[PDB]
Amino acid sequence: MAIIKEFMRFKVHMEGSVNGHEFEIEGEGEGRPYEGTQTAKLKVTKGGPLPFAWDILSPQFSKAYVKHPADIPDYLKLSFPEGFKWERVMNFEDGGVVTVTQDSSLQDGEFIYKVKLRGTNFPSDGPVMQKKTMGWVASSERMYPEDGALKGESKQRLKLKDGGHYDAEFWTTYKAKKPVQLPGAYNVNIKLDITSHNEDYTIVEQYERAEGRHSTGG
């Protein structure tokens, strides 16, 4: 409450590979952790221009910025200053797979994010390697505690240039670096937008709004 301020910056470093293409990204962001909003500016620093869709990377750049009601314990905010780690699997409907590990810490009053990502088995003709995706539809992550960690599961959908859709299932485990209070089951509603980018997506800005709720209705 005194360490997670109402306005917070973060720095993020990602290293990864997708279908064997290695890359690195460095970015900085800022937001309002109790209002559930944040923006980030990412720069490809190695391996650019990326030969695959930016959208598979965008969900990996910050769960300390989820608005929570008072009756749902904010496990990931409570994990600081030590922070938390998370591990994610994204299975896409055409066999593409992305696995991600992340470490979050707080240093000199800013969040520090370290991301490692491996994408594999994307079809050469599919919308990821052909850069045909056009952003994520608004989604809901089902959260529940299990084995001393916070788990989330969600069905996700990318829009496509041809007007169709491209679906994925996300599984994530979030683990605080110290024992803090886990919530019961609840839902996190997320909207993730690419707000600007240059022609080859080597410079990208994102905006995300996230809020935890009991409700399942839209």
Side-chain angles (χ1 to χ4, degrees), residues 2-198 200-218:
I3 68 189
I4 304 311
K5 308 193 172 325
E6 292 189 50
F7 175 82
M8 293 287 282
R9 298 183 178 283
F10 68 84
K11 294 179 182 168
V12 59
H13 163 83
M14 173 188 281
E15 56 192 49
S17 70
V18 175
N19 275 21
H21 180 97
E22 301 194 14
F23 65 93
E24 287 181 29
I25 290 162
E26 304 287 340
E28 307 84 45
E30 68 195 73
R32 286 123 182 104
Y34 304 92
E35 303 168 21
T37 63
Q38 57 181 134
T39 57
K41 187 174 188 185
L42 299 317
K43 305 191 167 70
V44 177
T45 56
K46 301 190 186 171
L50 306 169
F52 57 84
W54 181 266
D55 288 326
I56 64 167
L57 309 181
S58 62
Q60 333 306 335
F61 299 119
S62 44
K63 277 292 202 300
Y65 297 83
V66 178
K67 181 181 186 182
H68 281 79
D71 66 311
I72 301 181
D74 202 333
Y75 175 74
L76 297 177
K77 284 193 181 62
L78 290 167
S79 77
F80 289 94
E82 292 82 354
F84 62 96
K85 298 177 147 62
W86 55 263
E87 299 182 357
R88 171 173 292 166
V89 166
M90 299 149 59
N91 281 332
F92 292 85
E93 67 173 289
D94 64 354
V97 174
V98 179
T99 61
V100 191
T101 60
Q102 201 264 18
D103 183 277
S104 302
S105 58
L106 181 61
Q107 299 180 42
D108 299 315
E110 300 196 355
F111 295 119
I112 303 299
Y113 299 155
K114 300 293 182 58
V115 189
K116 298 183 173 169
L117 180 144
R118 192 201 54 235
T120 57
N121 202 46
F122 285 98
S124 64
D125 58 292
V128 167
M129 301 310 297
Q130 294 299 325
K131 296 187 222 183
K132 294 302 186 188
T133 66
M134 299 292 288
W136 299 95
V137 304
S139 61
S140 181
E141 190 182 6
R142 258 77 160 165
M143 316 301 302
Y144 61 101
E146 186 173 54
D147 293 325
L150 182 57
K151 309 239 181 139
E153 292 166 354
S154 68
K155 287 184 157 46
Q156 298 273 336
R157 168 167 289 187
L158 282 163
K159 297 166 281 185
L160 296 180
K161 290 182 171 57
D162 63 19
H165 63 268
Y166 174 58
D167 288 349
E169 295 180 87
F170 284 34
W171 294 262
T172 315
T173 297
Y174 311 86
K175 182 56 168 294
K177 289 166 184 170
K178 60 183 179 181
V180 290
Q181 183 189 10
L182 285 159
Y186 70 109
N187 300 307
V188 175
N189 297 331
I190 300 154
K191 187 58 205 295
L192 170 62
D193 301 319
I194 301 315
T195 56
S196 74
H197 60 87
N198 65 359
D200 62 3
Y201 285 82
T202 52
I203 305 288
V204 185
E205 302 192 20
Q206 319 191 161
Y207 168 87
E208 183 175 296
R209 183 177 191 289
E211 183 181 4
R213 292 183 175 268
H214 301 293
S215 183
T216 44

